[PDB]
Design a protein around this ligand. Structure first.
Ligand SMILES: COc1cc(OCC#Cc2ccc3ccncc3c2)ccc1C[NH+]1CC[NH2+]CC1
Length: 316
């Protein structure tokens, strides 16, 4: 049901077409700020509902310039609504297809932002496990924002040890997938590809792939370090952050740390919320500090975004 949602948000156009989910552009009424709302059906989700809730819980603990920001989670009889940072530039998937393949220097700029996000995810004790172009969006500055739940599919990006149900480290699986991503960025097609799941997979397990003639020697060396079938021989995130290829154009290690972490509550945002809710500062801070990802969380976070853009920190 939509009763609660529409008290807080005005719905605009659909932006996301999917199979288990829809995505709507929306306006957050109190702040006037645009958001994307992902709409998931519980019946559709079935016994994956508890897994989806565990992931939403993980997203609540991520705060990062290259990770899509969560504002609000609203659950009803049949739906879960996720209110997220609107990324207007669309999927990296569509960008790659539109350009054929990216120059080495553009792929480096983009790949550094992927590494930044993923390194941060690992630092917080998590792994993504479904990295692929459909799970990376561009914002209006053409900076990447990591998402999940975007839809042989992601089989082509799955690490061999992942593919055969065996024991694996999430971080190592993410490095493999980042290797596939690197290849597609520079080539515009997959390193392992086929018409059937059995064939695609055999290919993945063998680890052999063509090396198009336009790939630089240094690109080739990095790809072989990321696409090692044996996870033990795969390059670590530590060594990726300051890899020679990664630093070839911009001679600094990847800035993976959050640039915007939550330290203490922003006083200006607390002030505006206090006047609006007719509360004193202490009781308002106490409410916000629960971090329930309810409408209050959403309003706090959206006021914070307003302040970052130099806009009056004000509620309509
Ligand atoms: C980065 O971690 C997560 C991201 C998640 O994203 C959900 C979404 C979205 C989305 C879809 C379409 C859009 C269109 C326009 N603008 C914004 C849009 C946003 C969800 C969950 C996680 C948590 N993560 C999952 C993988 N394992 C580690 C935790």
């Amino acid at each position: 049901d939509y009763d609660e949602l529409l008290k807080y948000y005005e719905l605009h156009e659909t932006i996301g077409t999917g199979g288990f989910a829809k995505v709507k552009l929306a306006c957050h009424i109190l702040t006037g700020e645009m958001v994307a709302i992902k709409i998931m059906d519980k019946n559709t989700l079935g016994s994956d509902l508890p897994r989806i809730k565990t992931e939403i819980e993980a997203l609540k603990n991520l705060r990062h310039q290259h990770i899509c920001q969560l504002y609000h989670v609203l659950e009803t009889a049949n739906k879960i609504f996720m209110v997220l940072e609107y990324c207007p530039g669309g999927e990296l998937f569509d960008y790659i297809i539109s350009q054929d393949r990216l120059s080495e220097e553009e792929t480096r700029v983009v790949f550094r932002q992927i590494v930044s996000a993923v390194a941060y995810v690992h630092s917080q004790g998590y792994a993504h496990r479904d990295l692929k172009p459909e799970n990376l969006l561009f914002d209006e500055y053409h900076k990447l924002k990591l998402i999940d739940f975007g839809l042989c599919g992601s089989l082509a990006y799955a690490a061999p040890e992942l593919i055969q149900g065996k024991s694996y480290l999430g971080s190592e699986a993410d490095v493999w997938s980042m290797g596939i991503l690197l290849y597609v960025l520079m080539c515009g097609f997959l390193p392992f590809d086929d018409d059937t799941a059995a064939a695609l997979v055999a290919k993945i397990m063998r680890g052999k792939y063509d090396v198009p003639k336009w790939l630089s020697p240094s690109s080739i060396l990095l790809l072989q370090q990321m696409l090692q079938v044996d996870p033990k021989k795969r390059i670590s995130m530590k060594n990726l952050l300051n890899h020679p290829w990664i630093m070839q154009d911009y001679n600094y290690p990847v800035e993976w740390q959050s640039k915007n972490p939550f330290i203490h509550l922003d006083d200006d945002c607390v002030t505006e919320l206090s006047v609006h809710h007719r509360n004193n500062r202490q009781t308002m801070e106490d409410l916000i500090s629960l971090w329930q990802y309810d409408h209050l969380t959403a309003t706090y976070l959206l006021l914070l975004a307003k302040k970052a853009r130099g806009k009056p920190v004000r509620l309509r």
